Amino acid sequence: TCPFYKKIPGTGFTVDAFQYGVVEGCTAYFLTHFHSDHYAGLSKHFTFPVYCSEITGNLLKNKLHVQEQYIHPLPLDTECIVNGVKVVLLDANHCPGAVMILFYLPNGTVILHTGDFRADPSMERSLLADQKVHMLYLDTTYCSPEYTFPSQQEVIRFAINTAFEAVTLNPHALVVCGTYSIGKEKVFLAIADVLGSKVGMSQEKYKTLQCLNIPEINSLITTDMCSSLVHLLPMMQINFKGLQSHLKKCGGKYNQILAFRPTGWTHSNKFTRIADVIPQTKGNISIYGIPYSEHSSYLEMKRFVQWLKPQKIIPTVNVGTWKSRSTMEKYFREWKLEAGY
């Protein structure tokens, strides 16, 4: 059944709750972003109102074929009324079109639902600064102190410098980047930019990227693989067997692959710096795992919460085990006692 952390009390609303059939008493289904664990269940047969960003609405229409009459896009940073209740959508710093949602309940309670987010100090100057938030539905994906990772900027600098060096040493090297969802587009776009190439990809992935309102996108991507020296492939294919295979397909245009796997966290983060990362190599193929995250580090999460000072926190990630739930509740209490709220 629909879990309680997907329901917004005092409303008929649910958030990211599309896989339970008809939720009894739901008058509006919000969708925070277009990732499969969140939209799971939506299709062309859905006949209830869906409230989302413009970009998520483009993806619902074009990729899932949800009918236009049930898609309700809202602008960001704008007070809107939905079934009698004031809401605001805020940028979540996750993947394209990802939002946080502020609900202003008729009784005076204010609720923030983060969806998936990567907390940033810039959020402390949004419409969130303007009133008190009583209840926080929090993306707790990396809520443990071992989870450190570098900034997105540091990671992109590493990838750009690595690729440019390799291709300038060997003009017959191919760059490949893995993907299995939207998000992390900066990785392959920044590398293609430094190399003066467009990124080549499948027709399905090109269609997905054409929904994202990225400026000048027609200048940056293509379905012509032969004219491109940065290829995107399914993340599943980013291994030695899959890459040797791909290289055979390029018809002796290339003699070397340099591949990037943008992982979330991996335990080499507890020891190794970004300057010190090394690839796995077999023959003329090298694979780099780079820690490009679109979720909060533990310290970024802690700073956000200690700034916001919520009265109650409801985790939305890692909720399935008693040990995880108890560990998270311990951190929340530490944070509250340290900051004095």
Residue 128 to residue 114: CA distance in whole angstroms: 12
Half-sphere exposure of 125 (CA within 13 A, CB side): 3
Give least dist CB 49 to Ni ion, A: 22
Give least dist CB 92 to Ni ion, A: 9
Write the DSSP symbol of residue 23: P
Residue 90 to residue 196: CA distance in whole angstroms: 34
Q: What's the N-to-C CA distance of the chain in angstroms? A: 34
> Which residues ranging from 294 to 313 are in contact with Ni ion (CB under 5 A)?
none
Nearer of residues 198 and 205 to Ni ion, judged by Cβ: 205
Q: Closest by alpha carbon to 118, among 301, 270, 243?
A: 301
Give least dist CB 181 to Ni ion, A: 8
Give least dist CB 35 to Ni ion, A: 4
Give least dist CB 222 to Ni ion, A: 27
> Which residues ranging from 53 to 92 are in contact with Ni ion (CB under 5 A)?
none
Quickly tell me which residue has 């310290």 as its tokens. Answer: 299
Nearer of residues 35 and 118 to Ni ion, judged by Cβ: 35
Contacts with Ni ion: how many residues (CB under 5 A)? 2
Residue 304 to residue 145: CA distance in whole angstroms: 15
Give least dist CB 96 to Ni ion, A: 11
Q: Which stretch binds Ni ion (CB under 5 A): 43-51, 111-119, 253-261, 273-281?
A: 111-119
Nearer of residues 183 and 310 to Ni ion, judged by Cβ: 183
Radius of gyration of the chain (CA): 22
**Rounded to the nearest 10 degrees, how much is the dihedral formed by the CA atoms of 96, 71, 78, 8?**
-90
Task: Let me know if 58 is exposed, middle or buried by CB neighbors in 10 A (0-12, 13-18, 19+).
Answer: buried
Q: Closest by alpha carbon to 302, among 335, 337, 265?
A: 335
Report if residue 185 touches Ni ion, rule: CB under 5 A.
no
Give least dist CB 214 to Ni ion, A: 18
Q: Closest by alpha carbon to 203, among 220, 222, 186?
A: 222
Judged by CB under 5 A, which of 116, 139, 185, 300 binds Ni ion? 116
Nearer of residues 40 and 129 to Ni ion, judged by Cβ: 40
Nearer of residues 116 and 300 to Ni ion, judged by Cβ: 116
Would residue 161 be called left, alpha or beta, if left means φ above 0 and alpha means ψ between -120 and 50 degrees?
Answer: alpha
**In this structure, what are the phi and psi dihedrals at residue 289, rounded to the nearest 5 degrees?**
-90, 115
Nearer of residues 52 and 229 to Ni ion, judged by Cβ: 52
Nearer of residues 115 and 150 to Ni ion, judged by Cβ: 115
Nearer of residues 35 and 303 to Ni ion, judged by Cβ: 35
Q: Closest by alpha carbon to 155, among 177, 127, 129, 124?
A: 177
Give least dist CB 250 to Ni ion, A: 32
Give least dist CB 279 to Ni ion, A: 27
Binding mask 242-281 for Ni ion (x = CB under 5 A): ----------------------------------------
> Which residues ranging from 26 to 45 are in contact with Ni ion (CB under 5 A)?
35
Nearer of residues 66 and 182 to Ni ion, judged by Cβ: 182
Quickly tell me which residue has 């062309």 as its tokens. Answer: 44
Interface ranges with Ni ion (CB under 5 A): 35, 116
